[PDB]
Scaffold this motif. Structure first.
Motif, PDB file in Angstrom:
ATOM      1  N   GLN D  15     -24.756   5.129  39.517  1.00 45.89           N
ATOM      2  CA  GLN D  15     -24.259   3.888  38.931  1.00 45.89           C
ATOM      3  C   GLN D  15     -23.067   4.091  38.005  1.00 45.89           C
ATOM      4  N   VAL D  16     -23.172   5.056  37.099  1.00 49.18           N
ATOM      5  CA  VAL D  16     -22.088   5.333  36.168  1.00 49.18           C
ATOM      6  C   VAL D  16     -20.845   5.801  36.917  1.00 49.18           C
ATOM      7  N   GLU D  17     -21.041   6.656  37.915  1.00 45.68           N
ATOM      8  CA  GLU D  17     -19.937   7.171  38.714  1.00 45.68           C
ATOM      9  C   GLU D  17     -19.228   6.056  39.471  1.00 45.68           C
ATOM     10  N   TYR D  18     -20.003   5.098  39.974  1.00 39.85           N
ATOM     11  CA  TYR D  18     -19.459   3.967  40.722  1.00 39.85           C
ATOM     12  C   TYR D  18     -18.705   3.008  39.813  1.00 39.85           C
ATOM     13  N   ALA D  19     -19.117   2.943  38.550  1.00 38.55           N
ATOM     14  CA  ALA D  19     -18.483   2.077  37.561  1.00 38.55           C
ATOM     15  C   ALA D  19     -17.162   2.661  37.065  1.00 38.55           C
ATOM     16  N   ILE D  20     -16.991   3.969  37.236  1.00 38.83           N
ATOM     17  CA  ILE D  20     -15.772   4.659  36.841  1.00 38.83           C
ATOM     18  C   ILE D  20     -14.707   4.470  37.916  1.00 38.83           C
ATOM     19  N   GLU D  21     -15.149   4.152  39.130  1.00 35.41           N
ATOM     20  CA  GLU D  21     -14.254   3.912  40.254  1.00 35.41           C
ATOM     21  C   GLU D  21     -13.686   2.497  40.193  1.00 35.41           C
ATOM     22  N   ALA D  22     -14.357   1.628  39.441  1.00 41.02           N
ATOM     23  CA  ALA D  22     -13.940   0.243  39.281  1.00 41.02           C
ATOM     24  C   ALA D  22     -12.894   0.112  38.180  1.00 41.02           C
ATOM     25  N   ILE D  23     -12.744   1.168  37.384  1.00 40.82           N
ATOM     26  CA  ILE D  23     -11.769   1.193  36.301  1.00 40.82           C
ATOM     27  C   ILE D  23     -10.415   1.675  36.809  1.00 40.82           C
ATOM     28  N   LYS D  24     -10.393   2.170  38.043  1.00 44.97           N
ATOM     29  CA  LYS D  24      -9.174   2.652  38.677  1.00 44.97           C
ATOM     30  C   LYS D  24      -8.600   1.600  39.621  1.00 44.97           C
ATOM     31  N   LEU D  25      -8.861   0.333  39.318  1.00 46.17           N
ATOM     32  CA  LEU D  25      -8.377  -0.775  40.124  1.00 46.17           C
ATOM     33  C   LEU D  25      -7.706  -1.811  39.233  1.00 46.17           C
ATOM     34  N   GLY D  26      -8.018  -1.753  37.941  1.00 44.13           N
ATOM     35  CA  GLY D  26      -7.457  -2.675  36.973  1.00 44.13           C
ATOM     36  C   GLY D  26      -6.039  -2.306  36.594  1.00 44.13           C
ATOM     37  N   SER D  27      -5.402  -3.156  35.797  1.00 46.50           N
ATOM     38  CA  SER D  27      -4.035  -2.912  35.362  1.00 46.50           C
ATOM     39  C   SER D  27      -3.967  -1.751  34.373  1.00 46.50           C
ATOM     40  N   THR D  28      -2.804  -1.118  34.296  1.00 38.04           N
ATOM     41  CA  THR D  28      -2.603   0.030  33.424  1.00 38.04           C
ATOM     42  C   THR D  28      -2.401  -0.315  31.952  1.00 38.04           C
ATOM     43  N   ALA D  29      -3.142   0.375  31.094  1.00 37.88           N
ATOM     44  CA  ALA D  29      -3.047   0.189  29.658  1.00 37.88           C
ATOM     45  C   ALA D  29      -2.622   1.515  29.042  1.00 37.88           C
ATOM     46  N   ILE D  30      -1.701   1.469  28.087  1.00 33.23           N
ATOM     47  CA  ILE D  30      -1.222   2.688  27.449  1.00 33.23           C
ATOM     48  C   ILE D  30      -1.372   2.653  25.934  1.00 33.23           C
ATOM     49  N   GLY D  31      -1.932   3.721  25.381  1.00 28.78           N
ATOM     50  CA  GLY D  31      -2.127   3.822  23.949  1.00 28.78           C
ATOM     51  C   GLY D  31      -1.427   5.041  23.388  1.00 28.78           C
ATOM     52  N   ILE D  32      -0.711   4.855  22.286  1.00 31.43           N
ATOM     53  CA  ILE D  32      -0.002   5.951  21.644  1.00 31.43           C
ATOM     54  C   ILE D  32      -0.257   5.945  20.145  1.00 31.43           C
ATOM     55  N   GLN D  33      -0.676   7.089  19.617  1.00 32.53           N
ATOM     56  CA  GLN D  33      -0.958   7.216  18.197  1.00 32.53           C
ATOM     57  C   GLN D  33       0.120   8.024  17.489  1.00 32.53           C
ATOM     58  N   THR D  34       0.640   7.475  16.396  1.00 36.00           N
ATOM     59  CA  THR D  34       1.669   8.140  15.604  1.00 36.00           C
ATOM     60  C   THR D  34       1.268   8.110  14.136  1.00 36.00           C
ATOM     61  N   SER D  35       2.148   8.597  13.269  1.00 39.03           N
ATOM     62  CA  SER D  35       1.872   8.607  11.839  1.00 39.03           C
ATOM     63  C   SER D  35       2.200   7.251  11.229  1.00 39.03           C
TER      64      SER D  35
END
Lengths: 232, 228, 239, 231, 236, 234, 196, 204, 235
Positions: D15-35
């Protein structure tokens, strides 16, 4: 109590139950919605046009409150359950808060319920899509659309049902700022989109309208026959 | 326990489990119910055929109340549950209305319990068809509740093994204005159309219902009726 | 537990509920139930299936049930399932009358039972009720009414409708014989006899109930043996 | 067929593995951490032109100092987002102080594996959430960017990309990223990368952007602000 | 016959209307390899049973198939050992509960009925299986004399003059049939011991079988000792 | 095939496949080493960072002042058990006003982890624990797993490719009792290095250290504090 | 004490109530509204315990509005008066009993005007005219002497003034302003407030 | 007292082949009259009536709940309920609230649906039935009703004679009671008709 | 598929799921129990599967009560849970009736609790057998053994596990009835050494427990001195 997981993930990350619930919506009647300047139109295609049937008891366009109304597509029995829950939520919002609910607020609540049935034990997902339309306190025309999965979006003009792909395509190249100039062009637009999918267009097209600070009105057989002749 | 249904609908629109429970009733011991004007008579084949078995130990014809008797066809163990429920359902009715439950009322309450087992989770339908008789307001009553929960009113009916040939013979001998005494002879006559060997005083159980209430006949009584 | 479960309340590949669909096939083999709405009343005509010489009459009706003072109904399909639903209908009407001290409107009663049938096709893991109903009644909001629900919880108001065995041939014969707005009870009864004769007729093989208004009082009554017999003879004169 | 809590032969829950495959179909989100702060960006993936772009919300404010960008099944995210919001409001009520970004992520990560059929009541998850989260806020340890997935595993990262093109975006983040970047530089690089893994011509109404600096609160870039950064 | 769905796995009707699972529970009664016999006399009830004890390491004083339900009721179990003890435990509770609620001792036929009622629930509920054991109860009735009841795993029970259960059940009933077709305390005990002996052809010894009895003069249930069993064994 | 889906299904060989499938998660996780002396108990986990920009995930958690653990397998499950361990430790301090004996806490975990393996629908906790504590009976090292069995060892190692670490521990498990703090922490670091591939080595970004002694409360060393122990190895 | 009063005429029903909201010994409000609109032609006047009235009155209001929403038509004055009596009677022996006295006024198209009187023990009574509070003892006899079934709308208001005037000269409490409404076929109308 | 809070009085008398049931019409809280036409007698069949005295709120509640059960009972087994069976149904309903019961003492009057034999009874608050062959009273002025009934009642009274006796009984009984009166309504149940008249009583 | 559930009888009347749980007890190390003239002696051939384990880890002998001992074989996780269950029954019994629970009643109570997991598909049968031994001044010496199905008998000499069929033979020779606990210790220690496989299995530790008149009716592990004195005589 029945606590078996009905909706689960599949090998390629798909929720079969939700996809099967969306397949039921495609077999349902077509329901288009257009958001105008000071008017909101909801048109539905009466598949069954039986002459021995009481038309008042099989309407698809309901009312959730004084400012919010909606149409659906898919399982009729499921829609009723959803509509009755949304009606109860509207009165609850008028109790706690001392003001009418916004169109997005009730859309968010209907979407929240739909999503819950896709992640709960011993229960299948709802097989319907809603086209919530209404006006807010400021007088802004809203048009939202929810689906079986539980995701809702605000639209300008949308169609759901069997001929939604066609209507949408046709609406894409017809819905402008000049096409919804008044309260008659918007009605002629909804009827136009429905006429290119509904068999024997004319008497098989129920449609209600809603203007700012005004209850809901459902055009009858004569009113809609004048708009269908105007086009020609 | 399981929460899902064991009895579901098939492609043709049939409930196989209920239909398979009716096959259990059809292979059961033959039962006969006859309504003859001044009373009702219930008769059943009680062949233990083993000799060590104590004939008087158990009973097939049981009283549900003072004016209602019961007979069955099919599974004996399932019949005991229904008999206990029917007795409880009758006492409950008497505690509220302070009057013996009408035969028709008891048959509906018992049929409601049988319908519950064809829709509840983790349970199979009862494999026993019932034949309830009673006497209320100067009138004889004869009902028949099957495994599916449906019940019908009869004048004379056969149950269990060879019931198809029991009905035809029963219909060729049944008379509107028939007395209890004469109805007790036709009930035994239809039971003797498939009794293989010889019918004795403790080989078959008979129950009669008239205005004096429901009572199970005794060996002595059956012997006299069997001679004639 | 998860291997014996037949999964009655789940969607299928094409988006259809199989259990409900299979339950509607069971209603297609049952006795014919027809309803015709007139201007001065509404009637129910069900074909009796319990036909036998040794079958007693006992009850006042086999397929027609009185829900409350102004409403009656006709069931079709699993008779045992219909007994659970009719009892629930009476409890729903009595509950409404204990709360508002007034008779419950026809549509509100049908809707309450349709919500219960809808719940058995969504959750619980139990099989649905394999029974289709036909409601006839009179209320102060819409006068005479004729409704019809099904196993899925769907329901609609009709002028004239038929359910059960051969309900397709009856509906087609009702469309070409019904007069929207100009139908009288007497003429409605004649139409019912011509529809039951086509989808089949003796007077013991049918059961007819009418619901009319008399002095601000609803009256439901089952037509008697003789009462029906005459009707059957009058249709033979036109044939 | 099997249960939802069934382990596979390797040692992973199906189940968890199958739910991780559903996250590779959504739009791309990018996060960047700085000071200077954390910046979140995500493509809106507008299907039709008739749909309102503002109705789509993939970046939400958990609190004044915490933002959140999601990907995958958006309807599942709403359930988690509300829990995060209430969690931070409870913390404030009980301790008269804000909640850290790490604490919030951990609290939302406890619902990940809280599913199962048997031995559970009516109000229990039947399956796992098919959505990945990117929390970015500012607390006592300065700007921080945590990443949570469907398995309930959360980590800390300087630059993480989730979604259908995360694989491709990840490479670009590793190339154009150092531990001395400015908030304005982080934003620019975010849009560039987001503009290469897209299909539609990235405009001011096609994407979403939000930053969380140490000074001001969670802020969502306006159309004009986004249009001036695209220059 | 035929099969459909999971009729052979759970207690649900099959195409012919039979409960295969209940039929398999009757086949599990003969998996113990033993055989019990019960004979009813005129002033007593006799219960005798095979007492197999292979290894000498296993204490033979703890290997008994005869159980005391109440002060006046005794019984012999046949079939799965674990299931048998469970059933015996229930019978003791059912009997003690009856006396507490009604103020008088439970009749043997009522205890058998109660136990049979509990066994019928396993045949209807699919979540649990039926017990693979058999019970035979003996006792003296207040106004009926000695009684002998038997209830199987199908929930069916009955009263008998002489009954047998186990691997050797058919032959035991064929021999008892003739004995009743043609009885004092001694005559009854000898008849039961004979039936078991001739059916197995082993000439039972003092510590090879167990005997339980109830009489009219002595209703209290008791188990005969080796010496007492040897006194009846050297008279045949 | 038919005997590997549920935990309540015994196979024909007398085994429970599901329980063994939960043991495969422990072997897929990062290696962890736990060894003790006559006065100290230490844990050395090799925090692994999948992505190059991501931060190495924590492996060593706090349970109480005298108890620390090192997880391996399912992260969510490890937090589930850790929360339970903390609860039990807090209960003992509240009721008896004293530290819960390490052995007693380990038995509690064994009981709670066994229930799931016998019930239908439930699953076994897919996480391997390395408990390091110090009570009245000196330092302890316990090893729990998905089959609800726990062992008292002198030195242990679990996780991916930890057979090399295990083998190294056996060769030096004779000089641990006399081993001093730094020497004891070097043996654990040396044993953890064996699991790692020849190419990379034990830096200060991929190594965590938990220590618990007589007069030393359970402390953890991140990146800067790991240097002191690190610097000295060959 | 709060004051309620209703007068039913041939084809209309006139209602009035005080506008004072008092705490201990001070009038915190002088323009408080005690009338709750249940529907287009139904008015619910509620008085009693501090939080009980609004809590109970709003619950009934929400349910009556819900009724119309899902049914299309509105609940009639009689049905609405029975629905509220049932609710109030169900809490009587319950954990949280509502201590509220009320009058239900409405206009049905087929039944005409209707005035209902309900006390705190939930006893429903239909009447030509009714009043609630301590001021009802000084005004019920005034109504008794001057009320006639065919009383006109203009005379009904004049009759109401007499009652309100009696309170100004005889009641120990200070009730200066009154809310006056009227329900007929056209709906609910807001009449000028009667002040002194 | 809780039972005298609203006041009221009901009566039932047995005639030859008929029964009579009467009740006061006053509805009031303590010493203040609210209305003068409060219904106390309710029809439970064509020839079956029930009077209810006591707490006004409980009078309506018990009368509404009794109708709920009676309606279901008549639908289940298609037949009119018998007078004696209705008394058991009411007793059961009253005994259900054994500890915290309704404050009303019902009076049942009617004829059997197949033999038309007069039947009268009265139950207490907890549902204790009591069938008599003459008359039954209930209310605040029960002592005054007994006195009037005991000395006026005659065996085998015809409808006309029966009406006069129950009229004088109630009239004189409610005139000696402060919280009872404001009018009297009488129902005379015959075999083919039900006569209902209001009496000329005092209004003070 | 007749052996997938414990609530399913097979065609020949067998509960395969219960037989599969007894197969797991045959893979365990051999544990033996011997009741002498004044006590019971327990001996398990604890197999040390690692050198990193502490001497005494994974002990297969427990103390269910002060006067009761318990030797197990099979799934340690399951056996530990059964030991807790036995500790509760004995503890509850003392609170209710006011005295030490007789060994026969303890065996009965636990065996019936073990039999409850072999009826439904909701759970699975325990995969471990165990022996209960205790000594009382009035009751004497008792030794019971409960298997996976729930069957519990009294014994004189008992063995469960890998080589329980070979360890039983070497137990019949001894005359435990007239023997004594002190002398039986060595006998039991020698039996465990003979049946222990040294060609297939690895190394093992000797676990010895006893209860009787010498320990004043209290169950406790055999002292190091005696344990080593019997370990040398069996070697």
């Amino acid at each position: 109590s029945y606590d078996r997981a009905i909706t689960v993930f599949s090998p390629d990350g798909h929720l079969f139950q939700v996809e099967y619930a969306q397949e039921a919506v495609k077999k349902g009647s077509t329901a288009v919605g257009v958001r105008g300047k000071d008017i909101v139109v909801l048109g539905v295609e009466k598949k069954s046009v039986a002459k021995l049937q009481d038309e008042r008891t099989v309407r698809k366009i309901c009312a959730l409150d004084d400012n919010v109304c909606m149409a659906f597509a898919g399982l009729t029995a499921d829609a009723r359950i959803v509509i009755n829950r949304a009606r109860v939520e509207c009165q609850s919002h008028r109790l706690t808060v001392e003001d009418p609910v916004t169109v997005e607020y009730i859309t968010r609540y209907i979407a929240s319920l739909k999503q819950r049935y896709t992640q709960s034990n011993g229960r299948r997902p709802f097989g319907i899509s809603a086209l919530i339309v209404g006006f807010d306190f400021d007088g802004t025309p809203r048009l939202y659309q929810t689906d079986p999965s539980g995701t809702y979006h605000a639209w300008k003009a949308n169609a759901i049902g069997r001929g939604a792909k066609s209507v949408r395509e046709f609406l894409e190249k017809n819905y402008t700022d000049d096409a919804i100039e008044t309260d008659d062009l918007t009605i002629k637009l909804v009827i136009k989109a429905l006429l290119e999918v509904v068999q024997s267009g004319g008497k098989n097209i129920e449609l209600a309208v809603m203007r700012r600070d005004q209850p809901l009105k459902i055009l009858n057989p004569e009113e809609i026959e004048k708009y269908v002749a105007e086009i020609e | 326990g399981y929460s899902f249904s064991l009895t579901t609908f098939s492609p043709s629109g049939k409930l196989v489990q209920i239909e398979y429970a009716l096959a259990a009733v059809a292979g059961g011991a033959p039962s006969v119910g006859i309504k003859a004007a001044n009373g009702v008579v219930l008769a059943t084949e009680k062949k233990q055929k083993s000799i060590l078995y104590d004939e008087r130990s158990v009973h097939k014809v049981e009283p549900i109340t003072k004016h209602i008797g019961l007979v069955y066809s099919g599974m004996g163990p399932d019949y005991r549950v229904l008999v206990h429920r029917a007795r409880k359902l009758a006492q409950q009715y008497y505690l509220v209305y302070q009057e013996p439950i009408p035969t028709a009322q008891l048959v509906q309450r018992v049929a409601s319990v049988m319908q519950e087992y064809t829709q509840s989770g983790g349970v199979r339908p009862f494999g026993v068809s019932l034949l309830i008789c009673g006497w209320n307001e100067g009138r004889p009553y004869l009902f028949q509740s099957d495994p599916s929960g449906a019940y019908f009113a009869w004048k004379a009916t056969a149950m269990g093994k060879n019931y198809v040939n029991g009905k035809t013979f029963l219909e060729k001998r049944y008379n509107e204005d028939l007395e209890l005494e004469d109805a007790i002879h036709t009930a035994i006559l239809t039971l003797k159309e498939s009794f293989e060997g010889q019918m004795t005083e403790d080989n078959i159980e008979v129950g009669i219902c008239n205005e004096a209430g429901f009572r199970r006949l005794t060996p002595t009584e059956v012997r006299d009726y069997l001679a004639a | 537990s998860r291997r014996y479960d037949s999964r009655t309340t789940i969607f299928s590949p094409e988006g259809r509920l199989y259990q409900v669909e299979y339950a509607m096939e069971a209603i297609g083999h049952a006795g014919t139930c027809l309803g015709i709405l007139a201007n001065d009343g509404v009637l129910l005509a069900a074909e009796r299936r319990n036909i036998h010489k040794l079958l007693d009459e006992v009850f006042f009706s086999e397929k027609i049930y009185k829900l409350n003072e102004d409403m009656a109904c006709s069931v079709a399909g699993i008779t045992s399932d219909a007994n659970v639903l009719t009892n629930e209908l009476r409890l729903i009407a009595q509950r409404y009358l204990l709360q508002y001290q007034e008779p419950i409107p026809c549509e509100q009663l049908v809707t309450a039972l349709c919500d219960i049938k809808q719940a058995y096709t969504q959750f619980g893991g139990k099989r649905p009720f394999g029974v289709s109903l036909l409601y006839i009644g009179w209320d102060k909001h819409y006068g005479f009414q004729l409704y019809q629900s099904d196993p899925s919880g769907n329901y609609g108001g009709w002028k004239a409708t038929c359910i059960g065995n051969n309900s397709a041939a009856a509906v087609s014969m009702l469309k070409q014989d019904y007069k929207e707005g100009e139908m009288t009870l007497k003429s409605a009864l004649a139409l019912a006899v011509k529809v039951l004769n086509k989808t089949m007729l003796s007077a013991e093989k049918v059961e007819i109930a009418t619901l009319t208004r008399e002095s601000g009082k609803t009256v439901i009554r089952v037509l008697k043996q003789k009462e029906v017999e005459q009707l059957i003879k009058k249709h033979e004169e036109e044939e | 067929d099997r249960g939802v809590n069934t382990f596979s032969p390797e040692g992973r829950l199906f189940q968890v593995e199958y739910a991780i495959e559903a996250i590779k179909l959504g739009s791309t989100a990018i996060g960047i951490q700085t000071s200077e702060g954390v910046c979140l960006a995500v493509e809106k993936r507008i299907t039709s032109p008739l749909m309102e772009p503002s109705s789509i919300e993939k970046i939400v404010e958990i609190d004044a100092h915490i933002g959140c960008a999601m990907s995958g099944l958006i309807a599942d995210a709403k359930t988690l987002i509300d829990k995060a919001r209430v969690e931070t409001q409870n913390h404030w009520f009980t301790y008269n102080e804000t909640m850290t970004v790490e604490s919030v992520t951990q609290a939302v990560s406890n619902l990940a594996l809280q599913f199962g059929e048997e031995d559970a009541d009516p109000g229990a998850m039947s399956r796992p959430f098919g959505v990945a989260l990117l929390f970015g806020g500012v607390d006592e340890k300065g700007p921080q960017l945590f990443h949570m997935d469907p398995s309930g595993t959360f980590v800390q990262c300087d630059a993480r990309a989730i979604g259908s093109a995360s694989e491709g975006a990840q490479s670009s983040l590793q190339e154009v990223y150092h531990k001395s970047m400015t908030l304005k530089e982080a934003i620019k690089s975010s849009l560039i990368i987001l503009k290469q893994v897209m299909e539609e011509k990235l405009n001011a109404t096609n994407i979403e952007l939000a930053t969380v600096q140490p000074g001001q609160n969670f802020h969502m870039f306006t159309k004009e602000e986004l249009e001036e950064v695209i220059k | 016959g035929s099969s459909a769905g999971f009729d052979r796995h759970i207690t649900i009707f099959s195409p012919e209307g039979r409960l295969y699972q209940v039929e398999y529970a009757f086949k599990a009664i003969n998996q113990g390899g033993l055989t019990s016999v019960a004979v009813r006399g005129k002033d007593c009830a006799v219960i005798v049973t095979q007492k197999k004890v292979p290894d000498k390491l296993l204490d033979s004083s703890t290997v008994t198939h005869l159980f005391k339900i109440t002060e006046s009721i005794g019984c012999v179990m046949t079939g799965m050992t674990a299931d048998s003890r469970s059933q015996v435990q229930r019978a003791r509770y059912e009997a003690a509960n009856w006396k507490y609620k009604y103020g008088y001792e439970i009749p043997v036929d009522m205890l058998c009925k109660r136990i049979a009622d509990i066994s019928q629930v396993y045949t209807q509920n699919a979540e649990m299986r039926p017990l693979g054991c058999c019970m035979i109860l003996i006792g003296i009735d207040e106004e009926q004399g000695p009684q002998v009841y038997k209830c199987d795993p199908a929930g069916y029970y009955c009263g008998f003059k002489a009954t047998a259960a186990g691997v050797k059940q058919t032959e035991s009933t064929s021999f008892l049939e003739k004995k009743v077709k043609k009885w004092t305390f001694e005559q009854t005990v000898e008849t039961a011991i004979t039936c078991l002996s001739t059916v197995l052809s082993i000439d039972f010894k003092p510590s090879e079988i167990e005997v339980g009895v109830v009489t009219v003069e002595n209703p209290k249930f008791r188990i005969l000792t080796e010496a007492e069993i040897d006194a009846h064994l050297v008279a045949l | 095939n038919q005997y590997d889906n549920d935990v309540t299904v015994w196979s024909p060989q007398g085994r429970i496949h599901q329980i063994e499938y939960a043991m495969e998660a422990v072997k897929q996780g990062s290696a962890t080493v736990g060894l003790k002396s006559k006065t100290h108990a230490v844990l050395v986990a090799l925090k692994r960072a999948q992505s190059e920009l991501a931060a190495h995930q924590k492996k060593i958690l706090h349970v109480d002042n005298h108890i620390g653990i090192s997880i391996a397998g399912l992260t969510a499950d490890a937090r589930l058990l850790c929360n339970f361990m903390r609860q039990e430790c807090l209960d003992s301090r509240f009721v008896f006003d004293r530290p819960l004996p390490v052995s007693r806490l380990v038995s509690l975990i064994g009981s709670k982890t066994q229930i799931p393996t016998q019930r239908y629908g439930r699953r076994p906790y897919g996480v391997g624990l390395l408990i390091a504590g110090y009570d009245d009976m000196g330092p302890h090292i316990f090893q729990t797993c998905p089959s609800a069995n726990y062992f008292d060892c002198r030195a242990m190692s679990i996780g991916a490719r930890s057979q090399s670490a295990r083998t190294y521990l056996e060769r030096h498990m004779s000089e641990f009792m006399e081993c001093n703090l730094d020497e004891l922490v070097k043996h654990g670091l040396r044993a953890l290095r064996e699991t790692l591939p020849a190419e990379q080595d034990l830096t200060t970004k991929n190594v965590s250290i938990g220590i618990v002694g007589k007069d030393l409360e359970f402390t953890i060393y991140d990146d800067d504090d790991v240097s002191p122990f690190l610097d000295g190895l060959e | 004490m709060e004051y309620l009063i209703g007068i039913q005429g041939p084809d209309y029903v006139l209602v009035a109530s005080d506008r004072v909201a008092a705490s201990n010994i001070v009038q915190m409000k002088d323009d408080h509204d005690k009338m709750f609109k249940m529907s287009e032609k139904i008015l619910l006047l509620c008085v009693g315990e501090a939080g009980d009235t609004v809590q109970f009155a709003e619950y009934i209001q929400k349910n009556v509005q819900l009724y119309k929403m899902r049914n299309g038509y509105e609940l009639s004055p009689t049905a609405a008066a029975n629905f509220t009596r049932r609710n109030l009677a169900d809490c009587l022996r319950s954990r949280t009993p509502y201590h509220v006295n009320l009058l239900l006024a409405g206009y049905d198209e087929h039944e005409g005007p209707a005035l209902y009187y309900m006390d705190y023990l939930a006893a429903l009574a239909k009447a030509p005219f009714a009043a609630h509070g301590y001021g009802a003892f000084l005004t019920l006899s005034i109504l008794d002497r001057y009320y006639t079934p065919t009383i006109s709308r203009e005379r009904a208001v004049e009759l109401l003034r007499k009652c309100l005037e009696e309170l100004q000269k005889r009641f120990i409490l200070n009730l200066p302003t009154f809310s006056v409404r009227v329900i007929d076929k056209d709906g609910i109308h807001n009449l000028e407030n009667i002040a002194f | 007292s809780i039972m005298s809070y609203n006041g009221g009085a009901v009566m039932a008398m047995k005639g030859k082949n008929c029964v009579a049931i009467a009740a006061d019409r006053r509805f009031g809280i303590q010493a203040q009259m609210v209305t003068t036409d409060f219904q106390k007698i309710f029809p439970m069949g064509d020839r079956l009536y029930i009077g209810l005295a006591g707490l006004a709120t409980d009078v309506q509640t018990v009368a509404q709940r009794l109708k709920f059960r009676l309606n279901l009972y008549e639908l289940k087994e298609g037949r009119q309920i018998k007078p004696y069976t209705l008394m058991s149904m009411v007793a059961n309903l009253l005994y259900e609230k054994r500890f915290g019961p309704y404050y009303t003492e019902p009076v049942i009057a009617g004829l059997d649906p197949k033999t038309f034999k007069p039947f009268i009874c009265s139950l207490d608050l907890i549902g204790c039935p009591m069938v008599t062959d003459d008359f039954v009273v209930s209310g605040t002025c029960s002592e005054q009703m007994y006195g009037m009934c005991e000395s006026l009642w005659e065996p085998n009274m015809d409808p006309e004679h029966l009406f006069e006796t129950i009229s004088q009984a109630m009239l004189n009984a409610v005139d000696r009671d402060a919280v009872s009166g404001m009018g009297v309504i009488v129902h005379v149940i015959e075999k083919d008709k039900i006569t209902t008249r209001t009496l000329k009583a005092r209004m003070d | 598929g007749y052996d997938l559930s414990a609530s399913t009888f097979s065609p020949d009347g067998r509960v395969f799921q219960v037989e599969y749980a007894m197969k797991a007890v045959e893979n365990s190390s051999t544990a033996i129990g011997i009741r002498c003239k004044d006590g019971v002696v327990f001996g398990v051939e604890k197999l040390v599967l690692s050198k990193l384990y502490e001497e005494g880890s994974n002990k297969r002998l427990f103390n269910v009560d002060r006067h009761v001992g318990m030797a197990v074989a099979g799934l340690l996780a399951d056996a530990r849970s059964l030991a807790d269950i036995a500790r509760e029954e004995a503890s509850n019994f003392r609170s209710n009736f006011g005295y030490n629970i007789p060994l026969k009643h303890l065996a009965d109570r636990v065996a019936m609790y073990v039999h409850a997991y072999t009826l439904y598909s909701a759970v699975r049968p325990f995969g471990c057998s165990f022996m209960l031994g205790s000594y009382s001044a009035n009751d004497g010496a008792q030794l019971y053994m409960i298997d996976p199905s729930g069957v519990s008998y009294g014994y004189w000499g008992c063995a469960i596990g890998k080589a329980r069929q070979a360890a039983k033979t070497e137990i019949e020779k001894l005359q435990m009835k007239e023997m004594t606990c002190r002398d039986v210790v060595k006998e039991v220690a020698k039996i465990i050494y003979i049946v222990h496989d040294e060609v297939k299995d690895k190394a093992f530790e000797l676990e010895l427990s006893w209860v009787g008149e010498l320990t004043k009716g209290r169950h406790e592990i055999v002292p190091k001195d005696i344990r080593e004195e019997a370990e040398k005589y069996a070697k």
